[PDB]
Structure formats: structure tokens, C-alpha cells
Amino acid sequence: QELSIERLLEMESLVADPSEEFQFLRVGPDSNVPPKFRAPVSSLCQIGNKQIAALVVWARDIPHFSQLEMEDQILLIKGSWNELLLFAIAWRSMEFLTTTSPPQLMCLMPGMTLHRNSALQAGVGQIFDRVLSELSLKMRTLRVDQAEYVALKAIILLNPDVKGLKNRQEVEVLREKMFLCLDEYCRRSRSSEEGRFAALLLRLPALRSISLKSFEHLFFFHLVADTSIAGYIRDALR
Amino acid sequence: VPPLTANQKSLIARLVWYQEGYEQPSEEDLKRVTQTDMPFRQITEMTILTVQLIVEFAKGLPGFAKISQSDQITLLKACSSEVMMLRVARRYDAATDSVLFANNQAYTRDNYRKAGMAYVIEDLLHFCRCMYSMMMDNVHYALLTAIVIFSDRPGLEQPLLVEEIQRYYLNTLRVYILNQNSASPRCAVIFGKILGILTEIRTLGMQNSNMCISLKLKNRKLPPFLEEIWDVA
Ligand SMILES: C/C=C/CC/C=C/CC/C=C/CCCCCCC(=O)OC[C@H](COP(=O)(O)OCCN)OC(=O)CCCCCCC/C=C/C/C=C\CCC
Ligand SMILES: CC(C)(O)CC[C@@H](O)[C@](C)(O)[C@H]1CC[C@@]2(O)C3=CC(=O)[C@@H]4C[C@@H](O)[C@@H](O)C[C@]4(C)[C@H]3CC[C@]12C
Numbered sequence: 001q002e003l004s005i006e007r008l009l010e011m012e013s014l015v016a017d018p019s020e021e022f023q024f025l026r027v028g029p030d031s032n033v034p035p036k037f038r039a040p041v042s043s044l045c046q047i048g049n050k051q052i053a054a055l056v057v058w059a060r061d062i063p064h065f066s067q068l069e070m071e072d073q074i075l076l077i078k079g080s081w082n083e084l085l086l087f088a089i090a091w092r093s094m095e096f097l098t099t100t101s102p103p104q105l106m107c108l109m110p111g112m113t114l115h116r117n118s119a120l121q122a123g124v125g126q127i128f129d130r131v132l133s134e135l136s137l138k139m140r141t142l143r144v145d146q147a148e149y150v151a152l153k154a155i156i157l158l159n160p161d162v163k164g165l166k167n168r169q170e171v172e173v174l175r176e177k178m179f180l181c182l183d184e185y186c187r188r189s190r191s192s193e194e195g196r197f198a199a200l201l202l203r204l205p206a207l208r209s210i211s212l213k214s215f216e217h218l219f220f221f222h223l224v225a226d227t228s229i230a231g232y233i234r235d236a237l238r
Numbered sequence: 239v240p241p242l243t244a245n246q247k248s249l250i251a252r253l254v255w256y257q258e259g260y261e262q263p264s265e266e267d268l269k270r271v272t273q274t275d276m277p278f279r280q281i282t283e284m285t286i287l288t289v290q291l292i293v294e295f296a297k298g299l300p301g302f303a304k305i306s307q308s309d310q311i312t313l314l315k316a317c318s319s320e321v322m323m324l325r326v327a328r329r330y331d332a333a334t335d336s337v338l339f340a341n342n343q344a345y346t347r348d349n350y351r352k353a354g355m356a357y358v359i360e361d362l363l364h365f366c367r368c369m370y371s372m373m374m375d376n377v378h379y380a381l382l383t384a385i386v387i388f389s390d391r392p393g394l395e396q397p398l399l400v401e402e403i404q405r406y407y408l409n410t411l412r413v414y415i416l417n418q419n420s421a422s423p424r425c426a427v428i429f430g431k432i433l434g435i436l437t438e439i440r441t442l443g444m445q446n447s448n449m450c451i452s453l454k455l456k457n458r459k460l461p462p463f464l465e466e467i468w469d470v471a
Contacts, residue, residue, distance in 0.1 A: 130392065161368050161438055163361070176427045183426035197426065198408045198433060205437040206390065212444050 003063040003177045005185055008150035011061065016054035022232040024052045024081070028222040037122075045223060047109055048085065055084050056236045059157055064174055069166045074233045076171070079162045083211045084153060090135030090207075091149055097140055103132040127213050134206045142199055145189070151182045152200060156207070239421045246410045249300060253380040256298040261325070262340045263287040272341055275459065277353035284339060285322070286463050292321050296387050301403035309395055315467050316391040319443040321383055323365060324435075328379065330366035337366070354458060358449045365442055369435070378432060381411040386436065 001007065025045035027033055033041050059077050060066055066073070092107035106114040106128060119128035139149075155178045160171040186196045218224045225232075242250070262268075263284075271283050296302055296314060305313070329338045336344040350359040374382075388404035390397050411432070415425050450470045453460045460470065 126392075134390070161365075161434075163364055176430075179427045179430035180423060183423075183430075195405055195409060195412075197429070198405075198412065201430065201433045202390075202436070204434075205440050208437045208440040209444070212441060 001063045003154070003174060003181070005147050005151055005181050007063055008154055009147060011058065012146070012150060014058075014061075016050075016057045020053040020056070020236055021049075022053055022236060023049060023225055024229055024232060025049055025218075025223055026225060031222040033221055033223075041221075041223070044108070047112070051085055051088065051109065052081055053236065055081055056233060060237050062154060062157070068170055068174075070234070070237070072162075072165050072167060072171065073237060074230055075162050075164055076157055076159060077233050077237075078230060079159060080157045082215060083156050083207050086131060086211055086214065087135070087153065087156065087207055090131055090139065093132060093136045094140050097132075097136060102129060103137065106132060124217055127210060127217065130206075130210050130213075134210065135203065138203065138206075142196075144200065147185055147189070148182070148200055151178060151185065152203065154178050155182070155201075156204065240413055240416055242410070242413055242417060246413060249407075249410055250377055250380070250414065252298075252300070253384060254376055256295055257376065257380045257383070260291045260295045260298075261328070263291060268340055275353075277345075277349045278355075278458070280339070281345075281350070281353050281355065282459075282461055282464065286461055287340070288322055288325060289318055289464070289467060292318050292325075295321075295383065299384055299387065301388060301406070304403070305399065306395060309400065312391055312393050313387060313389075313400070315469065317387050317389060318467060319446040320386050320439040322446070323362070323439045323442045324369075324379065324383055324386070326362065327366050327369035330363070330370050332367070332370055335363060337363075354453070354456070355449060357452065358445055361442060361445060365438060368438075372431060374432070377414055378411070381407055381414065382432060382435065385411065386439070389436070 023045075025048045027038050027042045027045060031038075056077060060073070068076075089106060089108060092109075093103070093105065096105035096107055096113065097103050102116070104116045106116075106119075108114050114128075116125065116128060119125050144152075155175060158171055158175040158178060160168050160175060162171075165171060182200065183197050186200070190196050215224070219226075263271075267287055271280075271287065293314060296317075302310065326337050330336070331338055331344060334344055334346070336346045338344055347356075347359050347363065350356060384407045385404055388400050388407065390401060390404075394400060412425075412429055415429050419425050419428070447468060447470075450460060450464065450468050454465070454470050464470070
């Protein structure tokens with residue numbers, strides 16, 4: 001089984017197992033979230049935990065991934081889960097984009113949306129807007145398709161510059177494979193548009209900034225279980 | 239096999255000239271500063287000089303004078319810490335695992351410790367190792383620096399102009415790579431790895447922000463030039 005856009009495409013239509021209750025996100029006992037809003041935020045933490053668990057089962061079944069060192073596998077998911085979750089939110093929220101008032105709706109999951117006014121209430125309006133403009137809106141203008149989307153996901157995960165990797169080169173080969181796949185696809189689906197390869201990859205730095213900003217908010221509200229995350233990833237892959 | 243147009247070559251040559259002309263502070267600037275919290279003061283004072291050099295490279299870039307005064311500050315404040323990361327990568331010595339300053343003294347993990355900047359040096363040196371593992375040339379480096387400067391940033395009044403300007407530099411870089419490797423498939427890998435740097439310098443730039451905020455909170459003597467450009471509220 002080869003790492004290809006074809007195989008990544010058939011990996012999207014597969015469902016994570018319900019019995020992986022891991023609390024990457026949780027309202028802490030130390031948290032500064034007001035009493036009245038503990039319930040909604042706790043609910044959202046639970047929704048995020050479901051998705052994280054889905055990304056773990058996804059990552060584990062990427063061609064050649066399970067053949068990597070176990071400690072490296074843990075490091076790649078640990079370094080990428082937050083970016084992957086925001087990327088997926090941005091893909092889902094393209095549907096809810098309709099002078100030219102700023103987008104109001106962020107798709108957290110099928111059926112469920114987060115309204116801007118609530119991000120404003122929670123003091124995360126700036127970042128809500130950046131997800132929706134630099135990611136969702138941009139991916140709509142660029143017309144990124146599902147093939148392009150799953151390619152970028154794999155490239156996000158397969159990061160050889162992650163600190164503490166054992167067989168760094170074994171990740172580099174997997175990522176280089178993805179550059180080839182992505183470039184091949186772009187010259188075929190869109191041979192007219194010079195610059196598509198670069199244009200797709202310019203989303204990744206934007207996603208890194210947004211991801212780093214969201215961690216600052218998460219740690220301020222004591223929503224992230226930093227010490228336990230590595231253990232959960234090991235448990236889940238096992 | 240797509241050749242470089244006269245304008246792309248004129249662009250490449252210009253950037254290579256401005257690059258080496260601005261990679262080190264002037265003789266007099268450097269003598270004025272070294273005319274002497276030792277690690278801390280030389281780190282902060284050299285960082286002022288580095289940022290001044292980045293600004294002068296930026297202004298010499300074609301496309302920049304076409305951008306409004308307000309967007310120039312937006313671009314420069316956002317990008318200057320990221321470009322600074324490329325500049326240390328070029329001065330990294332693998333064998334001693336250290337950064338070579340413009341005065342030719344090697345600064346280690348230890349010197350940054352004593353200067354209270356242990357937070358920043360780990361990920362910086364790792365970046366340097368990964369960055370000197372690539373073996374990048376002067377043209378990749380020059381083009382990449384222009385690509386970082388003309389990146390999309392929050393608060394831009396004309397982000398489509400900036401995008402159009404950056405698109406020309408990305409193309410020049412892509413076409414320059416094709417001409418180095420006779421247009422084989424691996425040109426996409428080389429081009430992808432280079433673009434991958436854009437994402438790792440966003441982490442380092444934000445770490446630079448946090449370091450500045452930390453230093454201010456810990457009542458350390460951080461220059462106003464740097465506090466200003468990096469919005470150390
Ligand atoms: C990559 C991560 C994706 C995981 C997806 C799961 C989401 C986890 C929780 C994120 C909350 C989204 C904001 C909407 C909050 C809704 C409840 C509300 O209105 O309370 C306001 C309250 C007023 O209190 P207050 O103390 O008066 O607030 C201070 C003044 N505003 O606010 C609070 O008590 C704190 C709310 C928690 C905010 C954490 C946001 C950090 C994550 C940002 C990126 C995630 C994507 C969402 C983009 C918007
Ligand atoms: C909070 C802070 C002051 O911004 C930290 C900056 C610091 O972590 C950096 C990035 O590591 C700085 C400190 C000294 C530095 O400015 C430098 C000192 C130097 O002597 C030269 C000066 C110029 O020639 C630069 O182009 C390169 C170099 C190495 C630069 C690169 C960036 C460095 C290495």
C-alpha cells in the first residue's frame with residue numbers, strides 16, 4: 001500500500017471507534033471559566049476530544065506511518081493535532097460562507113456551528129476571524145478540492161522537523177512523497193494556473209500562526225491536558 | 239525547459255547584491271557598539287542592528303515602494319523577527335553548535351542562558367541544524383527572504399497587491415529551481431522543503447515575541463526600538 005492521494009481520499013470515508021475516551025481537552029479544576037459557561041465549554045471540549053481521537057485513528061492508518069518508530073508516531077501526532085483540528089474546522093466552514101460582512105459561522109462538526117457573537121463573548125473574535133478569512137475564505141477562492149485538502153493534512157502531520165524524532169529521515173521520505181503527489185495533482189487538475197503548488201502550501205504558515213494563537217487561549221483558560229497528551233496518544237495507537 | 243526571463247534575472251541579481259551588502263552591519267556601526275549584563279547587552283544591541291539591516295533590505299526590494307506606508311509598517315513589524323531567523327541560520331556553525339556574531343565571537347546555548355534567553359535558544363539552534371542540513375544557496379535565501387516579507391499578514395489594507403508581488407517572487411524561485419535541476423520531479427520536493435521553512439519561522443517569530451514580553455515583565459532592560467517593532471505591550 002502506497003502513500004497516494006487516492007489512498008488518502010479513501011481514508012476520509014472511515015469512522016473512528018467510539019471507545020477512545022481521552023481528555024486532551026477539559027475544563028480543569030483550576031480553570032478561570034465562569035460557572036455559567038462551564039457547561040457549554042465542557043461540551044465543546046468533549047466535541048474536540050472526539051475529533052482528536054478520530055485524527056489518531058486516521059494518522060495511524062496512513063500508509064507507512066505504523067512502520068515508523070512508536071515514539072516518533074507519538075511526537076508527530078502531538079506536534080500536529082491542534083493544526084489538524086483547525087484545518088478541519090476551516091474545511092467544514094467553507095459551506096457556511098455565503099458590504100461583504102465578515103463570516104459569522106464556524107463549523108465545529110457536522111450539524112454544529114459556532115456563532116461569531118459567542119467567540120466575541122469568549123474574547124476569541126480575532127482568531128475566529130482569522131480561521132474564517134485566512135483559511136476558509138482563502139480555500140474557497142483557491143477552490144481547493146478534497147484531494148488537495150487530504151494531501152495538505154498528510155503534509156501537516158508528516159513533519160520531519162519535530163523535536164526529538166529518532167528516524168528523522170523516515171519521516172522526510174514520507175513528506176517528500178507527498179510533495180510529489182501534490183505537485184503531480186496540481187499540474188493535472190489545474191494546468192492553467194501557475195502558482196497553485198505554492199498557493200496551497202502558503203496556507204500552512206498561516207495555519208501555524210493561528211494554531212499557536214489558539215494554544216495561548218487554551219492554556220489561559222486551562223483547557224489543555226499538556227502532561228497527559230503523550231500518554232493518551234500512546235494508549236490510542238496501541 | 240522554462241528559462242528565467244530578463245526581469246527575473248535582473249531581480250535575482252539585485253537581491254543577491256542587496257543581500258550581501260546588508261548581511262553584516264557597517265564597520266562604523268559595529269565599532270560603535272563593540273566600543274566596550276554583557277551577553278544581554280550585545281544580544282539586544284546586535285538585534286537592533288540586525289533589524290535595521292532587514293528594513294534596508296526590504297526597502298530595496300522591488301514591489302515595496304508600491305505598497306502604502308501603513309502596510310509597509312504592518313509588513314515590517316510582522317516579518318522582521320521571521321527574517322532574523324534566516325539570518326542566524328546562515329551564521330550557524332555546526333561543529334561548535336553555535337551562532338557566529340558579526341564581531342566573529344561564537345555564542346553558545348550558555349551565553350544565551352547567562353543573558354536570560356534560555357527560553358529561545360533551544361528551538362533556534364534546532365532550526366539552524368535543520369536549516370543548514372538543507373544546504374541552501376544565496377539565491378534560495380534571497381528569494382525566500384523576499385517571500386517572507388511579502389507574506390499575508392493581519393491588518394493589511396491591500397493584501398491582494400502584496401499577494402501579487404509575492405507571487406512574482408515565488409515564481410522566480412520555482413523557475414530558478416527548475417533551471418538548477420533540469421526540470422526533474424524532485425524540483426517540487428526542493429521547492430516544498432523551502433516553502434516548509436515559512437511555517438517553522440512562524441513558531442520562532444512568536445517565541446521571539448514571548449521572549450520580549452517575558453523580559454519586559456521581568457523588568458529587564460529591553461531597548462525601545464525593539465519594544466516598538468515587536469509590540470511589547
Ligand atoms: C484547536 C481547538 C479547537 C477545539 C474545538 C473545541 C472548542 C473548545 C472551546 C472553545 C470555545 C469557543 C468560543 C465560544 C465559547 C462559547 C461559550 C461562551 O460564550 O462563553 C463566553 C465566556 C465568557 O467568559 P469571560 O471570562 O467573561 O471571558 C473573558 C472576556 N471575553 O468565555 C469563556 O468562559 C472561555 C471560553 C473558552 C474559549 C477558549 C478558546 C480557545 C480556542 C480557540 C480556537 C478554537 C476554535 C474556536 C475559534 C473561536
Ligand atoms: C529577544 C531578542 C533580543 O529579539 C532575541 C534575539 C535572539 O534570540 C537572536 C535571534 O538569536 C539574535 C541575537 C543576536 C542576533 O541579532 C545577531 C547578532 C549578530 O552579530 C549578527 C548580526 C547580523 O549580521 C545578522 O544578519 C546575523 C547575526 C548573527 C544576528 C542574527 C540574530 C541574532 C542571533
